[PDB]
Symmetry: D2
Subunit: 179 residues, 4 copies
């Protein structure tokens, strides 16, 4: 019986265990929590309401094929519809990303992505219901760097809807301060 | 990467236990015909990453299977698991003539076979077989660390039918 | 504020109103209730839990492009995945349908389809929850004949899970008695 | 048939009010990028039935829009309507500078524009524009029986961008 749900990207070198029998795991292209995705939501509702899990962790990673492909203007087929949610996030932060050296943008979008997905997670009926009946539950947004094996917590962390707004809002403001 | 592995979200089932792995994990290692998430994964691997093997790995003592068999109002996940209840019914006569102790194990294996059968019927895999692309599909069940069942193994629509029928027939012994 | 939810096929001459401001309406290819379909389920959960609707009616129709296409062994693309649920139903009743003049099979599969979809509907958490807290709710399976404007109730009718099993089971037995 | 119409499941919105119609209806007339149901409808119409027009029809005084704006624990449908809350936020500055009485109406129109914009970005429609197939997309809003807004109208990816920007700019007056 596990204490953590990890949501991670299907990309190659990213395994939740390796990275960090205690893990319940979902893996999809670019570690997405899409609001109407039955697959991910069912993982989340089973973990929260059934296995009484208390931590959900969304882990993106640098050099993500999903992120790269979402940014390439390319006719790949079905997957392009999956990644339109990433393109929507890109444009929601277009000013920010535009201001950046083109070869740095992927890494930034990976980071932004993680914050957006936590924000989505935090607004599911599953998570709000659970928070609202006093169930203890915390959400985390991490980015793991394949270049140097180092995790990089993103200080998106939420234990309530109010804290969700605050850390989401701050994480975006921190990312907009450009080195 | 060279393999796409589709495995259960359940706790002890890491794809790696067996850098070349693209992974999807969902409750009860399902390929639902109309699941945009899993299908996306399948299309990207087959059409873009050029993966030549897709492996559906189930496991013994699986909470998805157990919950699918229990009458219980669990909420959303129940809807996800209705596809496994349909599979229980499809093989209801086989599973009936069996000790209530060991039904989960059987349905765990049958489930794997049915997901490969579904996988091999996606437009994605069919039309890649049809344009000469090399692509094989596998159905494993895992425990003591070992693989218990291979069963279904397909390289073409033709071999899909045969491996599926034969896999079910071996289980009905 | 409507009293009926109708689920019908997107095919051309089939409009719920015309056929029979009181209707909430969902239309998809071959009038499907797929267990993991967020779109249809959301219609159903809003109707039942929010608008307090008391009748849900699934209407198929003869000469259905969806049904025909599901039976043709044909490379149409994405839609083929949608219609694999119809092909599954076909094979669940293969003995029955096989025993039939090939040009009658479409019409029979349309009928069978309606029963299967009601059975799916009747097993949603939404509908079982509602029945189980004593909410009044009835499910209907109809086939409308385009050839002669006549509806044709299929005597799938359920007001409870026990009645669901019985009418589903009977509707299939009636259809297996071949004229 | 020659038109695919995508309209709201809500009560007074029959496609026919305006034999040539293929219809889809869902809460708040949405085209969600990853909605297998609506996308199937779109792919079948475009690739198989050869429909040359797709029309997204929204309506005034729409329960989907109202519920999306209300803070209310409605259950599953809330998840469906999160995509409209994202659209509220995307145009939050426009909708803020507006009387709380008339926000629903505005967001009803903006919603229509965003769904056409999504429709025009599906692989299905893009790749049919790219192989020379004639296909136009429309965004209507309906009430007294009349159509209130046309706004977005697209025949190519190029015309998609222009019609979408301009439609939003006309609404920000
Ligand atoms: K899905
Ligand atoms: K869906
Ligand atoms: Zn990745
Ligand atoms: Zn499992
Ligand atoms: Zn039809
Ligand atoms: Zn509406």
């Amino acid at each position: 019986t596990p204490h953590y749900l990890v949501i991670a990207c299907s990309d190659s070198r990213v395994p939740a265990e390796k990275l960090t029998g205690e893990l319940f795991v979902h893996r999809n292209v670019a570690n997405q929590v899409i609001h109407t995705d039955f697959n991910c939501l069912s993982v989340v509702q089973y973990a929260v309401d059934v296995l009484k899990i208390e931590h959900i962790i969304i882990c993106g990673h640098t050099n993500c094929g999903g992120i790269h492909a979402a940014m390439a203007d390319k006719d790949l087929g079905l997957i392009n519809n999956w990644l339109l949610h990433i393109r929507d996030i890109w444009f929601k932060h277009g000013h920010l990303l535009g201001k950046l050296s083109p070869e740095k943008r992927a890494d930034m979008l990976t980071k932004i992505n993680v914050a957006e997905q936590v924000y989505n997670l935090g607004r599911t009926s599953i998570v709000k219901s659970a928070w609202e009946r006093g169930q203890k539950l915390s959400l985390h947004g991490w980015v793991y760097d394949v270049n140097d094996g180092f995790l990089v917590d993103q200080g998106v962390m939420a234990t309530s809807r109010e804290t969700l707004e605050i850390s989401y809002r701050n994480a975006i403001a921190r990312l907009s301060i450009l080195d």
